[PDB]
Design an enzyme around this catalytic site. Structure first.
Site, PDB file in Angstrom:
ATOM      1  N   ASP A 124     -24.420  28.309  26.218  1.00 53.44           N
ATOM      2  CA  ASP A 124     -23.311  28.931  26.520  1.00 53.44           C
ATOM      3  C   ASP A 124     -22.142  28.296  27.243  1.00 53.44           C
ATOM      4  O   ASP A 124     -22.529  27.681  28.152  1.00 53.44           O
ATOM      5  CB  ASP A 124     -23.819  30.245  27.523  1.00 53.44           C
ATOM      6  CG  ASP A 124     -23.061  31.542  27.223  1.00 53.44           C
ATOM      7  OD1 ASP A 124     -23.592  32.344  26.526  1.00 53.44           O
ATOM      8  OD2 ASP A 124     -21.969  31.724  28.022  1.00 53.44           O
ATOM      9  N   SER A 182     -17.978  35.911  25.882  1.00 54.88           N
ATOM     10  CA  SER A 182     -19.549  35.769  25.120  1.00 54.88           C
ATOM     11  C   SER A 182     -20.160  37.037  24.416  1.00 54.88           C
ATOM     12  O   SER A 182     -20.885  36.720  23.708  1.00 54.88           O
ATOM     13  CB  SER A 182     -20.696  35.627  26.545  1.00 54.88           C
ATOM     14  OG  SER A 182     -19.986  34.645  27.239  1.00 54.88           O
ATOM     15  N   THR A 215     -25.168  37.390  25.118  1.00 53.92           N
ATOM     16  CA  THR A 215     -25.727  36.507  24.134  1.00 53.92           C
ATOM     17  C   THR A 215     -27.044  37.092  23.484  1.00 53.92           C
ATOM     18  O   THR A 215     -27.330  37.271  22.549  1.00 53.92           O
ATOM     19  CB  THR A 215     -25.728  35.016  24.584  1.00 53.92           C
ATOM     20  OG1 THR A 215     -24.574  34.914  25.215  1.00 53.92           O
ATOM     21  CG2 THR A 215     -26.110  34.383  23.577  1.00 53.92           C
ATOM     22  N   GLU A 220     -31.182  30.628  23.998  1.00 52.76           N
ATOM     23  CA  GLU A 220     -29.961  30.297  24.821  1.00 52.76           C
ATOM     24  C   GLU A 220     -29.878  29.685  26.077  1.00 52.76           C
ATOM     25  O   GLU A 220     -30.977  30.401  26.988  1.00 52.76           O
ATOM     26  CB  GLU A 220     -29.161  31.570  25.065  1.00 52.76           C
ATOM     27  CG  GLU A 220     -27.747  31.331  25.395  1.00 52.76           C
ATOM     28  CD  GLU A 220     -27.444  32.629  26.416  1.00 52.76           C
ATOM     29  OE1 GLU A 220     -26.055  32.576  26.813  1.00 52.76           O
ATOM     30  OE2 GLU A 220     -28.188  33.510  26.700  1.00 52.76           O
ATOM     31  N   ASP A 278     -22.829  27.925  31.152  1.00 54.83           N
ATOM     32  CA  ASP A 278     -21.606  28.605  31.102  1.00 54.83           C
ATOM     33  C   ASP A 278     -21.186  28.963  32.703  1.00 54.83           C
ATOM     34  O   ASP A 278     -20.490  29.066  33.267  1.00 54.83           O
ATOM     35  CB  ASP A 278     -21.887  30.095  30.454  1.00 54.83           C
ATOM     36  CG  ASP A 278     -20.569  30.726  30.632  1.00 54.83           C
ATOM     37  OD1 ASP A 278     -19.469  30.425  29.847  1.00 54.83           O
ATOM     38  OD2 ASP A 278     -20.504  32.076  30.753  1.00 54.83           O
ATOM     39  N   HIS A 338     -18.348  28.312  35.467  1.00 57.17           N
ATOM     40  CA  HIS A 338     -17.522  29.148  35.986  1.00 57.17           C
ATOM     41  C   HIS A 338     -17.695  29.186  37.441  1.00 57.17           C
ATOM     42  O   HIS A 338     -16.856  29.230  38.274  1.00 57.17           O
ATOM     43  CB  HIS A 338     -18.226  30.698  35.679  1.00 57.17           C
ATOM     44  CG  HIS A 338     -17.595  31.380  34.493  1.00 57.17           C
ATOM     45  ND1 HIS A 338     -16.534  31.900  34.142  1.00 57.17           N
ATOM     46  CD2 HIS A 338     -18.486  31.873  33.433  1.00 57.17           C
ATOM     47  CE1 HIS A 338     -16.627  32.132  32.809  1.00 57.17           C
ATOM     48  NE2 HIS A 338     -17.595  32.373  32.402  1.00 57.17           N
ATOM     49  N   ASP A 374     -20.896  29.172  22.123  1.00 58.13           N
ATOM     50  CA  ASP A 374     -20.263  30.440  21.714  1.00 58.13           C
ATOM     51  C   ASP A 374     -18.926  30.300  21.932  1.00 58.13           C
ATOM     52  O   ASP A 374     -18.031  30.675  21.165  1.00 58.13           O
ATOM     53  CB  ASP A 374     -20.757  31.480  22.685  1.00 58.13           C
ATOM     54  CG  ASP A 374     -20.817  31.270  23.913  1.00 58.13           C
ATOM     55  OD1 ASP A 374     -21.381  32.160  24.634  1.00 58.13           O
ATOM     56  OD2 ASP A 374     -20.618  30.269  24.463  1.00 58.13           O
ATOM     57  N   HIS A 375     -18.216  29.436  23.087  1.00 59.62           N
ATOM     58  CA  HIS A 375     -16.813  29.185  23.195  1.00 59.62           C
ATOM     59  C   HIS A 375     -16.757  27.695  23.961  1.00 59.62           C
ATOM     60  O   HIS A 375     -17.796  27.462  24.535  1.00 59.62           O
ATOM     61  CB  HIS A 375     -16.160  30.302  23.851  1.00 59.62           C
ATOM     62  CG  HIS A 375     -17.110  30.527  25.357  1.00 59.62           C
ATOM     63  ND1 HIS A 375     -16.947  29.917  26.519  1.00 59.62           N
ATOM     64  CD2 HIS A 375     -17.777  31.705  25.658  1.00 59.62           C
ATOM     65  CE1 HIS A 375     -17.641  30.558  27.329  1.00 59.62           C
ATOM     66  NE2 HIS A 375     -18.397  31.445  26.818  1.00 59.62           N
ATOM     67  N   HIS A 418     -12.972  30.546  30.598  1.00 64.08           N
ATOM     68  CA  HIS A 418     -13.312  30.035  29.139  1.00 64.08           C
ATOM     69  C   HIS A 418     -12.060  29.375  28.613  1.00 64.08           C
ATOM     70  O   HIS A 418     -11.062  29.553  29.280  1.00 64.08           O
ATOM     71  CB  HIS A 418     -13.718  31.054  28.344  1.00 64.08           C
ATOM     72  CG  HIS A 418     -15.009  32.004  28.576  1.00 64.08           C
ATOM     73  ND1 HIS A 418     -15.499  32.797  27.860  1.00 64.08           N
ATOM     74  CD2 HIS A 418     -15.938  31.655  29.550  1.00 64.08           C
ATOM     75  CE1 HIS A 418     -16.578  33.238  28.329  1.00 64.08           C
ATOM     76  NE2 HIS A 418     -16.736  32.661  29.461  1.00 64.08           N
TER      77      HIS A 418
HETATM   78 MG   LIG Z   1     -24.536  34.001  27.706  1.00 60.43          MG
HETATM   79 ZN   LIG Z   2     -20.290  32.571  26.660  1.00 62.39          ZN
HETATM   80 ZN   LIG Z   3     -18.521  32.823  30.683  1.00 59.17          ZN
END
Ligand SMILES: [Mg+2]
Ligand SMILES: [Zn+2]
Ligand SMILES: [Zn+2]
Ligand SMILES: [Mg+2]
Ligand SMILES: [Zn+2]
Ligand SMILES: [Zn+2]
EC number: 3.1.3.1
Lengths: 444, 444
Positions: free
Chosen positions: B46, B97, B150, B317, B322, B326, B364-365, B407
């Site tokens: 992630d 996400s 996710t 995952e 992620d 953050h 995912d990003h 993101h």
């Molecule tokens: Mg996730």
């Molecule tokens: Zn994500």
């Molecule tokens: Zn995020």
């Protein structure tokens, strides 16, 4: 191995956002060739990491669009480009343009600021030098001063990229200084290198006079002329050229410094996405129609170099993607990526038609720009832009409280097309590219 | 198509930094297979863009090092992941996400916050629901709460990813609310989805009681049990599991919220690389030894799942990459990347042995983190770290003045191994990945 990677249709519908038209397996298996390339074109977008490719596409072509040049290379991978610390010989994770250019042209890592020399200040031959040696034609084009790190790493071996001419070398690269037994400044080593085609900017440094040797007393321009160089200063005289070889090497100086950017747009500002209206780029009025474009230079070079029978090696650089990224100027940055895409289209067309040409498009390092949410309240410089999709895209520059925004160490995309292109797939290093070209041309 | 991508030797010497030991053409040509895949393992990091991968590599393995799992996938490409604006149906350049998970599991783009529904709020079958219908075994593992975007995108169709259990759904996704005749909250749809193996955190939401239906008044945890689910809550009981199928589905709840992070380190600060000394990550002292690691869960899942003769689909995952991005916590983030690499090694080891398994690793990003020069004076949050190289690496987080770093929209790496892996090379979209899997499995 499609040549159309644009969304298939209605992006809000199932499968409409898809870029793949079918199965790549066969197509890809069919683009894998280990036969030697006869020519090699290495396009370098200075500072063009994946973030820079995505934003320009979103802007100029739209989220679901695709660059007909930059995005059409079927074989892709990611490559590392860290430099070395001069003292310790330990990785310096964020490279400058000099150490990185030295890496693919030489195949050896080095410290930031070094051109053509390893951490011991020892010279190593560049790929252009080995190509010329084997009888291949050589080209070097860029939108920056020819003395700049990227074009320079192919023809000069200097301890500091700052040694542009005789006067900077005397004081900053005294061991390279001509009057001190050195090979000379960047401009002088460029003139000595004698590649068949050399185009870019940086004419101002040619007004300096040599301090030693045969052409001592004569400006570097006079020396170029005295040595057999054809000199052209605009689009018109460039097109007029009919041949360039070791007898009549070509030298284009289209600007005193760097060639003008193609688009105009304001500089990103603090809370610019919030306090300032979305912008739409416009053409740069300071840039003349007499100043050739990167695609024009790329096309002319290919025409002149393609006359050689052993083949040719050409390196093209969209220099100002980097410069405008440092300047936190989205428009100037996107315009320069579009400009480069054109140069890549010219290359790909020749490559596809000729069939023995390896084309490679990558960047020397990553940079500052990030694509963030429209509503982002960032600590750095921001700006909202009106894209082709008719939507707003916000770009952020938040890694420097100083005017200049910095490079970054993220691995980036490297894509290729042609003989030996499979060597760009997966994780590789910037120094591997050197070996990939050296072997594709059988340049051993 | 090699397995070792580490620098060859002395990175200060010519060719010492190369990652290629030869020519990939033949090797790659041999790894190109369009035979049907019997199994698919999709590992998602992630928010793990190329920048995240590079930072974690430089830190844990050194700049010239290589992730034995993450960097060992031969076929690579870059893919886009823009979402859609719900009103306009125009691209929203930076996805969340939920919208991204929905794109690869469903094949259609949607707005940020949507799970399993297009911009019209219409449901679309997920790749897990389609594999289950075909008789394949299904697995869903994550380090985050199972109600998280996710893992949830695979089994729930909710208009807002915030509709975890009965109560939140009532107020935020009333049309999905069980009482209003909706399919239920994320947790309830997960229970109904009945994948063979489901492991992660998020036991907190399981303490809610259904508001309507056959199990109303009974907690979601009790309901799971009433429906024949094997409930495991620690490593010991997990490892104790002999089988999991449609009559004995496995449900593992290892944490109330997200599973604990592997490494500890301080949060990046304003001028952290300058005012504070380099940090060295340490293992997380509060992480109980009885909590499974992502690789242990991946390993157990693969074992139970591989018992199905038709094949299986498993999504894994590494969620906290992620979160820590953050949180602007480099150590937590890098540790979660190292964590995922271990899961990837288990996946790959299996894939190489079985031979009909497609393994894919992507994100995912993109996210906030940037690798900047040691002396960088950034306007955001920075921190100096001591790498495996014994060198200092600076990480920067400068896209948000809020308490959470955002993101980013840059296209990112997607790598694959196995039959149909070729469909990952070049430029693709997040929705193509859906089609690649569906086709690989013959899940038409
Ligand atoms: Mg996730
Ligand atoms: Zn994500
Ligand atoms: Zn995020
Ligand atoms: Mg440059
Ligand atoms: Zn550069
Ligand atoms: Zn730069």
């Amino acid at each position: 191995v499609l040549e159309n990677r644009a969304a298939q249709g209605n992006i809000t519908a199932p499968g409409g956002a898809r870029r793949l038209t079918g199965d790549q397996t066969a197509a890809l298996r069919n683009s894998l060739s280990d036969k030697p390339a006869k020519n090699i074109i290495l396009l370098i977008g200075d500072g063009m990491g994946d973030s820079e490719i995505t934003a320009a596409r979103n802007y100029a072509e739209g989220a679901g669009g695709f660059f007909k040049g930059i995005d059409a290379l079927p074989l892709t991978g990611q490559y590392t480009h860290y430099a070395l610390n001069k003292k310790t010989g330990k990785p310096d994770y964020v490279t400058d343009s000099a150490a990185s250019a030295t890496a693919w042209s030489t195949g050896v890592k080095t410290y930031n600021g070094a051109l053509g020399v390893d951490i011991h200040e020892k010279d190593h031959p560049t790929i252009l030098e080995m190509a010329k040696a084997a009888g291949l034609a050589t080209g070097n084009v860029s939108t920056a001063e020819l003395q700049h790190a990227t074009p320079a790493a192919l023809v000069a071996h200097v301890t500091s990229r700052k040694c542009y001419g005789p006067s900077a070398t005397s004081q900053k690269c005294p061991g390279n200084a001509l009057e001190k037994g050195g090979k000379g400044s960047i401009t002088e080593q460029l003139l000595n290198a004698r590649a068949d085609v050399t185009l870019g900017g940086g004419a101002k440094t040619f007004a300096e006079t040599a301090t030693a040797g045969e052409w001592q007393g004569k400006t570097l321009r006079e020396e170029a002329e005295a040595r057999g160089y054809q000199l052209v200063s605009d689009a018109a005289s460039l097109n007029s050229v009919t041949e360039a070889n070791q007898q009549k090497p070509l030298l284009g100086l289209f600007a005193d410094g760097n060639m003008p950017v193609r688009w105009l747009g304001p500089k990103a500002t603090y809370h610019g996405n919030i306090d300032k209206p979305a912008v739409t780029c416009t053409p740069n009025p300071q840039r003349n129609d007499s100043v050739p474009t990167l695609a024009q230079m790329t096309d002319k070079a290919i025409e002149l170099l393609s006359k050689n029978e052993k083949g040719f090696f050409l390196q093209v650089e969209g220099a100002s993607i980097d410069k405008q990224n440092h300047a936190a100027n989205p428009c100037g940055q996107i315009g320069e990526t579009v400009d480069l895409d054109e140069a890549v289209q010219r290359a790909l067309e020749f490559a596809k038609k000729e069939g023995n040409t390896l084309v490679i498009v990558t960047a020397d390092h990553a940079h500052a720009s990030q694509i963030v949410a429209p509503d982002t309240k960032a600590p750095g410089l921001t700006q909202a832009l009106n894209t082709k999709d008719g939507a707003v895209m916000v770009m952020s520059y938040g890694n420097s409280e100083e005017d200049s925004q910095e490079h970054t160490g993220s691995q980036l995309r490297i894509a290729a097309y042609g003989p030996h292109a499979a060597n760009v797939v997966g994780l590789t290093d910037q120094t591997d590219l050197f070996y990939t070209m050296k072997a594709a041309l059988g340049l051993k």
